[PDB]
Design a protein around this ligand. Structure first.
Ligand code: BG7
Length: 221
């Protein structure tokens, strides 16, 4: 009963691709990316949320290490605990570790909960992308082919299921008989297909795309 193909960009739920630079904050970009879609669905407004807010404030208590890495799930937990996250406009991205400067005056979103999906279940991931929205995931990006990707459905024979880079699944589809996940990266427009990579789908959890998926929600109230 699920759609054969999904692309949440078609519903105006995905902000512009960002550029993380030399700061290892893909976990933070993946987290705000997922929440940006839920905020758009609830309020009608598409607003980039502050990845920097996560880097500076969702730190040791959440197991995160700022520009040295982190988790989307504990980023969501911080937003829940903190009762908000600032807009990127008010708290812009500097690709550096800074003191926490969260200001509730510029809160642009909240988070009520988040859900984790079972490891390696690409069918379950498909259902969530179709029925809930863009899903935060990790992938194994430690391959020159990933950095060098330009177009088409990416398949890396030496990929593993051990994730190391946070990204956002904003959809899925098929290209000339190859199924793919539509993945928003945080390496700017010049990476891949305008900042996106289409990654092999239903090929045994390729590059760990379904190893650790999660997504937040903003509930009425
Ligand atoms: C340096 C740092 C602070 C964080 C980090 O590494 N982030 C990368 C990252 C990690 C995870 C992640 N989630 N889980 C669930 C439990 C998580 N709790 C504890 C919160 C885990 C991981 C990583 N993992 C594994 O891969 C398992 C294997 C790791 C190396 N062989 C042995 C097992 C452990 C459990 C998911 C997404 C991302 C993403 F997207 F950012 F790439």
């Amino acid at each position: 009963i699920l759609p054969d193909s999904v692309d949440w960009r078609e519903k105006g739920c995905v902000t512009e691709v960002k550029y993380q630079g030399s700061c290892g904050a893909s976990w933070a970009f993946s987290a705000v990316g997922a929440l940006e879609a839920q905020l758009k669905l609830k309020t009608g407004k598409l607003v980039s949320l502050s990845a920097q807010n996560l880097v500076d404030c969702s730190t040791e208590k959440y197991g995160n290490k700022g520009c040295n890495g982190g988790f989307m799930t504990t980023a969501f937990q911080y937003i829940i605990d903190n009762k908000g996250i600032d807009s990127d406009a008010s708290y812009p991205y500097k690709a550096m570790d800074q003191k926490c400067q969260y200001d509730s005056k510029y809160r642009a979103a909240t988070c009520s909960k988040y859900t984790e999906l079972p490891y390696g279940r690409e069918d379950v991931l498909k259902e969530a992308v179709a029925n809930k929205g863009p899903v935060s995931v990790g992938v194994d990006a430690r391959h020159p082919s990933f950095f060098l990707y330009r177009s088409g459905v990416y398949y890396e024979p030496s990929c593993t299921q051990n994730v190391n880079h946070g990204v956002l699944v904003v959809g899925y589809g098929d290209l000339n008989g190859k199924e793919y996940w539509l993945v928003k990266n945080s390496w700017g427009h010049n990476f891949g297909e305008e900042g996106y990579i289409r990654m092999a789908r239903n090929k045994g959890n390729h590059c760990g795309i379904a190893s650790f998926p999660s997504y937040p929600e903003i509930l009425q109230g």
